[PDB]
Amino acid sequence: DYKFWYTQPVPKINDEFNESVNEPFISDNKVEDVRKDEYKLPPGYSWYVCDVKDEKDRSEIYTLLTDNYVEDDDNIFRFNYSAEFLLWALTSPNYLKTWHIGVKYDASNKLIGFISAIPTDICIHKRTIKMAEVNFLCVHKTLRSKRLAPVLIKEITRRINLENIWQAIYTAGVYLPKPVSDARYYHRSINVKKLIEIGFSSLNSRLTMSRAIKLYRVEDTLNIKNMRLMKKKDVEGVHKLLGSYLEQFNLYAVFTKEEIAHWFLPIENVIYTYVNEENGKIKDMISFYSLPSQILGNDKYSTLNAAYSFYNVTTTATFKQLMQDAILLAKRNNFDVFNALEVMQNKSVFEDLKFGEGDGSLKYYLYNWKCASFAPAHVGIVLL
């Protein structure tokens, strides 16, 4: 049963829609009727408006996530998004401070809950809808299974609806009512030895340590020799290349020139974008973001450095060549592992490029939207 989810404008567990259905569950909503009062929290807890632009507020959000955010099923790893990453993720064009919602415990003044949204135009099945992208829902490990999460969700929904937005996109590893797509992740080993010493990867009697190192070795030469860090001048070119590529997919964000500069211009230890320019034209792009995991209870290593495949477009190479280059660029930036979802064209290169299947999948969800579900090849958006 999904006692909370079932009260919400999302599909029931059995709902399945034709490709021709593509619409809200609840249309003709009115901003004027949205509740003005904040949702009621348990006694001794208060809403707090986080200023992601303030170093100190931002560090409180960081601590909460470092200690309490997503772990894998074996709880060896916990996501450790850096402060400077959270600042990029939360301050895209037209972002609203009042969509960055904390909850404090009054007696300690400590942040013990968070939820965020940013505004994004989302094209679902060729209809572009102004939506909210929701992320970084977190409750402190000590406060789990007390029905705080639905209060966080309902408060942000109300804050979102105040801006006349009635749809959202979000992703979770947990299964909820009901995904529009479901994409397994794959991982390409870069620093083999580390990955074995921490348990992520393993050896058979056939595959010895030296043999595993050799298996994953890469040639430090790019397939596209002029692939270079993106610069401000490249923004219009990236806009045209990415914008045109993304139109083939069933689900994707429609990016303005301003969002392209926000989402792609490199920031050390956050976002890496490389371009291939020919006649002042951007004809190829690789991008990936930095998402470390903290390694729980390993005597030797505290952090796994991990590049996450973001948006990759080639017109002068094979997609395999392009991704092979993405892997090398991540190795050049001291990543231990390169992670990708089986979205867009990704899956076609995983065998050849020596990716291993992960343990699970990332589900893609819409709020207050009814449509046909689809295979993840047709997914054209990567969240943070």
Ligand X SMILES: CCCCCCCCCCCCCC(=O)CSCCNC(=O)CCNC(=O)[C@H](O)C(C)(C)COP(=O)(O)OP(=O)(O)OC[C@H]1O[C@@H](n2cnc3c(N)ncnc32)[C@H](O)[C@@H]1OP(=O)(O)O
Residue 364 labeled ligand binder = no
CA–CA distance, 31 with 322 (Å, rounded to integer): 46
Q: Which is nearer to ligand YBN, 29 or 82 (CB)?
A: 82
Q: Which is nearer to Mg ion, 68 or 157 (CB)?
A: 68
Q: Which is nearer to ligand YBN, 15 or 359 (CB)?
A: 359
173 touches ligand YBN by CB under 6 A: yes
Residue 145 labeled ligand binder = yes
358 touches ligand YBN by CB under 6 A: yes
Binding partner of residue 341 among ligand X, Mg ion, ligand YBN, none, CB under 5 to 8 Å per kind? ligand YBN
Output the smallest distance, CB 196 to ligand YBN, in A: 15
Residue 2 labeled ligand binder = yes
Residue 4 labeled ligand binder = yes
Are 267 and 218 in contact by the 8 Å Cβ rule? The answer is no
118 touches ligand X by CB under 6 A: no
Binding partner of residue 201 among Mg ion, ligand YBN, ligand X, none, CB under 5 to 8 Å per kind? none
Mapping DSSP onto H, E and C, the string for the chain reads CCCCHHHCCCCCCCCCCCCCCEECCCCCCCHHHCCCCCCCCCCCEEEEECCCCCHHHHHHHHHHHHHHCCECCCCCEEECCCHHHHHHHHCCCCCCHHHEEEEEECCCCEEEEEEEEEEEEEEECCEEEEEEEEEEEEECHHHCCCCHHHHHHHHHHHHHHCCCCCCEEEEECCCCCCCCEEEEEEEEECCHHHHHHCCCCCCCCCCCHHHHHHHHCCCCCCCCCCCEECCHHHHHHHHHHHHHHHCCCCEEECCCHHHHHHHHCCECCCEEEEEEEECCEEEEEEEEEECCEEECCCCCCCEECEEEECCCEECCCCHHHHHHHHHHHHHHCCCCEEEEECCCCCHHHHCCCCCEEEEEEEEEEEECCEECCCCHHHECCCCC
Each residue 130-159 as x (binds ligand X by CB under 6 A) or -, in order, gives --x-xxxxxx----xxxxxxx--x--xx--
Size of the site for ligand X (CB under 6 A): 36
Binding partner of residue 339 among ligand YBN, Mg ion, ligand X, none, CB under 5 to 8 Å per kind? ligand YBN
Residue 47 labeled ligand binder = no
Q: Which is nearer to ligand YBN, 260 or 362 (CB)?
A: 362
185 touches ligand YBN by CB under 6 A: yes
39 touches ligand X by CB under 6 A: no
Give burial (CB, 10 Å; 0-12/13-18/19+) of 369. Answer: buried
Residue 137 labeled ligand binder = yes
Q: Which of residues 339-378 bind ligand X (CB under 6 A)?
A: 367-368
CA–CA distance, 142 with 149 (Å, rounded to integer): 13
Size of the site for ligand YBN (CB under 6 A): 20
Residue 5 labeled ligand binder = yes
Q: Which of 207, 218, 377, 383 binds ligand YBN (CB under 6 A)?
A: 383
Residues that constitute the known binding site for tetradecanoyl-CoA: 2, 4-5, 69, 136-137, 139, 145, 147-149
* Contacts with ligand X, residue ranges (CB under 6 A): 2-5, 68-70, 132, 134-139, 144-150, 153, 156-157, 160, 165-168, 170-172, 174, 176, 367-368
Residue numbers at the binding site for ligand YBN (CB under 6 A): 70-72, 77-79, 171, 173, 185, 293, 308-309, 339-341, 358, 362, 382-384
What are the binding residues for Mg(2+)? 143, 299
